[PDB]
Amino acid sequence: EAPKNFGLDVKITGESENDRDLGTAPGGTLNDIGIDLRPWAFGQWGDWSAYFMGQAVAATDTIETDTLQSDTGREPDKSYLAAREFWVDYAGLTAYPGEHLRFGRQRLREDSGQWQDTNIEALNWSFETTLLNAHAGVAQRFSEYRTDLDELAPEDKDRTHVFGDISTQWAPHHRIGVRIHHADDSGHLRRPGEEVDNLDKTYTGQLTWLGIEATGDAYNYRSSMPLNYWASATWLTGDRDNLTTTTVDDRRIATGKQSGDVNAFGVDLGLRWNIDEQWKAGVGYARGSGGGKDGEEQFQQTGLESNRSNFTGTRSRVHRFGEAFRGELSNLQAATLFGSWQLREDYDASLVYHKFWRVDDDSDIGTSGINAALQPGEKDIGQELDLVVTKYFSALIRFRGGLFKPGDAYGPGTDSTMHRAFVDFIWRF
Ligand SMILES: CCCCCCCC/C=C\CCCCCCCC(=O)OC[C@H](O)CO
Ligand SMILES: CCCCCCCCCCCC[N+](C)(C)[O-]
Ligand SMILES: CCCCCCCCCCCC[N+](C)(C)[O-]
Ligand code: NA
Numbered sequence: 001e002a003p004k005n006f007g008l009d010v011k012i013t014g015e016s017e018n019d020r021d022l023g024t025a026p027g028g029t030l031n032d033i034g035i036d037l038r039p040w041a042f043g044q045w046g047d048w049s050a051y052f053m054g055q056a057v058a059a060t061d062t063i064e065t066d067t068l069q070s071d072t073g074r075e076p077d078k079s080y081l082a083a084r085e086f087w088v089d090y091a092g093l094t095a096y097p098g099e100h101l102r103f104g105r106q107r108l109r110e111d112s113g114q115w116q117d118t119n120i121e122a123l124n125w126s127f128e129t130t131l132l133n134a135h136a137g138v139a140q141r142f143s144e145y146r147t148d149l150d151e152l153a154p155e156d157k158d159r160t161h162v163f164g165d166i167s168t169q170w171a172p173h174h175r176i177g178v179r180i181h182h183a184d185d186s187g188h189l190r191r192p193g194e195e196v197d198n199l200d201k202t203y204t205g206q207l208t209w210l211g212i213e214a215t216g217d218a219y220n221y222r223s224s225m226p227l228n229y230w231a232s233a234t235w236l237t238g239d240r241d242n243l244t245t246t247t248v249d250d251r252r253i254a255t256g257k258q259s260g261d262v263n264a265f266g267v268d269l270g271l272r273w274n275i276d277e278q279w280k281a282g283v284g285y286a287r288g289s290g291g292g293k294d295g296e297e298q299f300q301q302t303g304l305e306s307n308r309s310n311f312t313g314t315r316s317r318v319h320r321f322g323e324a325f326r327g328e329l330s331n332l333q334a335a336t337l338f339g340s341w342q343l344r345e346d347y348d349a350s351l352v353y354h355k356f357w358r359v360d361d362d363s364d365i366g367t368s369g370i371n372a373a374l375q376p377g378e379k380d381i382g383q384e385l386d387l388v389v390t391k392y393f394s395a396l397i398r399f400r401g402g403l404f405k406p407g408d409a410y411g412p413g414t415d416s417t418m419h420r421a422f423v424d425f426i427w428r429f
Pocket of ligand 2 (some may be wrong): 006007008
């Protein structure tokens with residue numbers, strides 16, 4: 001019971017992925033295994049505490065051993081070292097032990113995973129009581145802290161994140177709240193005539209997300225309520241200066257840039273039936289605006305998101321928009337069916353169906369686990385069936401599977417079916 005100062009996380013991960021590009025580019029296939037050692041240290045002295053977690057990975061190929069990876073001077077190696085988290089924490093600001101201030105590289109996380117779920121350098125203030133939850137923090141990436149990555153993602157470079165939220169429990173297990181997030185770019189874009197690589201930035205933006213959120217045990221997998229729900233509306237405002245480019249002799253040259261106001265809208269609705277103590281089923285609809293006058297309605301998430309939550313009502317967390325498609329709520333429309341089952345804390349299982357549309361036929365969608373160009377004039381992105389099965393021993397064995405059936409929007413020459421699967425075996429000392 002003595003508060004544990006250190007431990008080690010072991011994970012054997014094998015991943016099957018075929019094919020990310022829908023057979024348009026050479027290779028790009030995964031069918032590889034790896035191990036991921038994560039030692040962690042923790043100290044606590046009254047109101048003060050400190051924590052470090054490192055990461056050692058060795059794999060047969062650049063497989064994904066971390067759902068919070070920065071997606072890829074930016075070519076990762078099959079094996080690498082990494083400092084995932086390092087932070088100091090003070091909790092003596094108030095007598096509420098749910099209140100604390102955390103400084104360093106830390107796990108920023110909100111329940112839906114659509115606003116922030118990542119490890120990033122930040123100073124975050126958390127205030128979590130029964131009646132009132134409030135968070136405030138500032139974050140920015142200065143490095144990946146890994147032996148195989150030299151540079152930041154262009155989007156992370158010189159981007160500062162400020163964010164805050166406040167919510168109350170107006171009814172037992174019913175939460176209403178507001179959430180704000182601001183992303184500011186201090187970087188520069190390539191001047192006209194300049195060669196632009198893959199690590200130059202697409203744009204520089206001053207973006208602000210204004211969110212309403214109503215939840216009723218939306219991500220509480222032990223809900224005593226027969227019905228759980230999540231509902232959120234988010235307004236994205238600000239401006240973007242997008243870099244315009246042109247190709248001269250198989251190399252892209254900067255041609256200028258255009259400024260433009262962003263006035264987008266994002267909605268995510270969900271209802272989960274608690275049929276009995278084991279079986280649960282539910283429905284979701286999430287829409288990210290896209291297109292509009294000069295792209296003004298192109299919604300986009302914060303860049304810190306993971307879009308992974310326990311929306312299926314299980315202890316295991318599932319990607320909100322498919323483990324294969326991994327859609328970002330951007331120019332995106334999603335209808336989601338899911339059934340889930342769980343036996344105490346020994347097992348949980350989830351079967352999730354998705355269908356994806358575009359909002360605008362000439363506008364690309366946000367990030368995804370699919371690297372295939374979209375046909376102009378076509379909304380039908382495709383369908384996806386997911387299956388997550390987990391057995392908890394601390395330790396756990398988990399299969400995450402996504403089967404993506406591309407729609408008409410991907411067109412000729414593309415594979416009729418793409419899958420991404422994982423078998424995660426985790427052990428805690
Ligand atoms: C307890 C709830 C908290 C308060 C929340 C109240 C506001 C939303 C309530 C129901 C929305 C249900 C909408 C059902 C799904 C909509 C499907 C849809 O709209 O897709 C068509 C699209 O708009 C293009 O045609
Ligand atoms: C190889 C350098 C990093 C490894 C640091 C040590 C790993 C953590 C050791 C804790 C082992 C867990 N336990 C409970 C058995 O002590
Ligand atoms: C969902 C199951 C995950 C499949 C894991 C398969 C591991 C096979 C590892 C063999 C590595 C050989 N090679 C050339 C592919 O790196
Ligand atoms: Na406290």
